[PDB]
Amino acid sequence: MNIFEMLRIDEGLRLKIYKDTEGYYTIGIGHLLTKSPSLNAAKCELDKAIGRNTAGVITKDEAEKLFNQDVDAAVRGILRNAKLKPVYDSLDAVRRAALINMVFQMGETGVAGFTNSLRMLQQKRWDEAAVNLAKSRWYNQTPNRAKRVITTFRTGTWDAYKNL
Ligand SMILES: *SCC1=CC(C)(C)N(O)C1(C)C
């Protein structure tokens, strides 16, 4: 397994616009289109992002293209972030995937704010890290997703995903 497969599990795949748990227009594999409440504005963001008049519908290949752009942006966001980079360097492969997952879902700045969790992760205090990670709006907004990611940070294995 790898970051792409991991995220594909967590985000799913939608070919039409839907709203995320924040009520924001999204499409494909967790691609946020805009925070605007206007569906029309969201449809235009989609056309802009895809490069054609989509009438609000994309193909699987288009979804995957947005996905590749998004994972790339998440990884670059971590590598250029003073708080995230050092931690990412210290992590093993599987745990690095969990970090990329968090950034993909809530952004570089939002994850960089998990100050205590990041400290515990850099110190390989996995049990403590897991507990600190749950002290967050994230743990409550998307519980099952946050649990899979947290459990991954604790075990350093793909077990939370392979079961599925
Ligand atoms: S849907 C029309 C539209 C609006 C804006 C975001 C300015 N565009 O890029 C297009 C041409 C998609």
Side-chain angles (χ1 to χ4, degrees), residues 40 43-45 47-48:
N40 286 325
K43 288 186 186 178
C44 277
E45 277 313 303
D47 281 10
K48 175 184 178 177

PDB file of all heavy atoms in Angstrom, residues 40 43-45 47-48, ligand 1:
ATOM      1  N   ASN A  40     -23.031  27.518  -8.275  1.00  0.00           N
ATOM      2  CA  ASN A  40     -22.628  27.990  -9.595  1.00  0.00           C
ATOM      3  C   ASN A  40     -21.142  28.370  -9.591  1.00  0.00           C
ATOM      4  O   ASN A  40     -20.412  28.059 -10.537  1.00  0.00           O
ATOM      5  CB  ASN A  40     -23.500  29.172 -10.040  1.00  0.00           C
ATOM      6  CG  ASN A  40     -24.899  28.725 -10.449  1.00  0.00           C
ATOM      7  OD1 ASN A  40     -25.064  27.649 -11.010  1.00  0.00           O
ATOM      8  ND2 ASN A  40     -25.902  29.552 -10.179  1.00  0.00           N
ATOM      9  N   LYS A  43     -19.223  25.238  -9.709  1.00  0.00           N
ATOM     10  CA  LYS A  43     -19.202  24.597 -11.015  1.00  0.00           C
ATOM     11  C   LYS A  43     -18.189  25.260 -11.933  1.00  0.00           C
ATOM     12  O   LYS A  43     -17.573  24.602 -12.761  1.00  0.00           O
ATOM     13  CB  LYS A  43     -20.592  24.645 -11.656  1.00  0.00           C
ATOM     14  CG  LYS A  43     -21.568  23.690 -10.979  1.00  0.00           C
ATOM     15  CD  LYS A  43     -22.910  23.628 -11.707  1.00  0.00           C
ATOM     16  CE  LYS A  43     -23.893  22.787 -10.911  1.00  0.00           C
ATOM     17  NZ  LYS A  43     -25.241  22.737 -11.563  1.00  0.00           N
ATOM     18  N   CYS A  44     -18.029  26.571 -11.789  1.00  0.00           N
ATOM     19  CA  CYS A  44     -17.070  27.298 -12.601  1.00  0.00           C
ATOM     20  C   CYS A  44     -15.655  26.981 -12.115  1.00  0.00           C
ATOM     21  O   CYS A  44     -14.729  26.913 -12.921  1.00  0.00           O
ATOM     22  CB  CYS A  44     -17.387  28.790 -12.558  1.00  0.00           C
ATOM     23  SG  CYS A  44     -18.693  29.184 -13.774  1.00  0.00           S
ATOM     24  N   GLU A  45     -15.477  26.779 -10.813  1.00  0.00           N
ATOM     25  CA  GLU A  45     -14.140  26.409 -10.317  1.00  0.00           C
ATOM     26  C   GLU A  45     -13.782  25.056 -10.927  1.00  0.00           C
ATOM     27  O   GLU A  45     -12.646  24.805 -11.328  1.00  0.00           O
ATOM     28  CB  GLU A  45     -14.109  26.279  -8.787  1.00  0.00           C
ATOM     29  CG  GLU A  45     -13.934  27.601  -8.067  1.00  0.00           C
ATOM     30  CD  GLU A  45     -12.818  28.413  -8.680  1.00  0.00           C
ATOM     31  OE1 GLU A  45     -11.677  27.897  -8.736  1.00  0.00           O
ATOM     32  OE2 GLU A  45     -13.088  29.557  -9.128  1.00  0.00           O
ATOM     33  N   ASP A  47     -14.836  23.747 -13.835  1.00  0.00           N
ATOM     34  CA  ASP A  47     -14.491  23.900 -15.258  1.00  0.00           C
ATOM     35  C   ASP A  47     -13.100  24.479 -15.374  1.00  0.00           C
ATOM     36  O   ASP A  47     -12.326  24.109 -16.247  1.00  0.00           O
ATOM     37  CB  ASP A  47     -15.469  24.848 -15.953  1.00  0.00           C
ATOM     38  CG  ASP A  47     -16.780  24.174 -16.304  1.00  0.00           C
ATOM     39  OD1 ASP A  47     -16.971  23.042 -15.841  1.00  0.00           O
ATOM     40  OD2 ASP A  47     -17.606  24.763 -17.043  1.00  0.00           O
ATOM     41  N   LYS A  48     -12.787  25.411 -14.483  1.00  0.00           N
ATOM     42  CA  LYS A  48     -11.484  26.046 -14.509  1.00  0.00           C
ATOM     43  C   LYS A  48     -10.397  25.017 -14.202  1.00  0.00           C
ATOM     44  O   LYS A  48      -9.368  24.980 -14.863  1.00  0.00           O
ATOM     45  CB  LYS A  48     -11.442  27.176 -13.489  1.00  0.00           C
ATOM     46  CG  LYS A  48     -10.044  27.843 -13.354  1.00  0.00           C
ATOM     47  CD  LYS A  48     -10.038  28.908 -12.254  1.00  0.00           C
ATOM     48  CE  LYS A  48      -8.648  29.539 -12.072  1.00  0.00           C
ATOM     49  NZ  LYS A  48      -8.692  30.626 -11.037  1.00  0.00           N
TER      50      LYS A  48
HETATM   51  S1  LIG B   1     -18.081  28.622 -15.546  1.00  0.00           S
HETATM   52  C1  LIG B   1     -17.361  30.072 -16.316  1.00  0.00           C
HETATM   53  C2  LIG B   1     -15.921  30.505 -15.797  1.00  0.00           C
HETATM   54  C3  LIG B   1     -15.647  31.297 -14.731  1.00  0.00           C
HETATM   55  C4  LIG B   1     -14.182  31.422 -14.384  1.00  0.00           C
HETATM   56  C5  LIG B   1     -13.804  30.788 -12.973  1.00  0.00           C
HETATM   57  C6  LIG B   1     -13.680  32.929 -14.463  1.00  0.00           C
HETATM   58  N1  LIG B   1     -13.606  30.566 -15.553  1.00  0.00           N
HETATM   59  O1  LIG B   1     -12.466  30.183 -15.469  1.00  0.00           O
HETATM   60  C7  LIG B   1     -14.617  29.960 -16.419  1.00  0.00           C
HETATM   61  C8  LIG B   1     -14.298  30.324 -17.935  1.00  0.00           C
HETATM   62  C9  LIG B   1     -14.587  28.451 -16.159  1.00  0.00           C
END
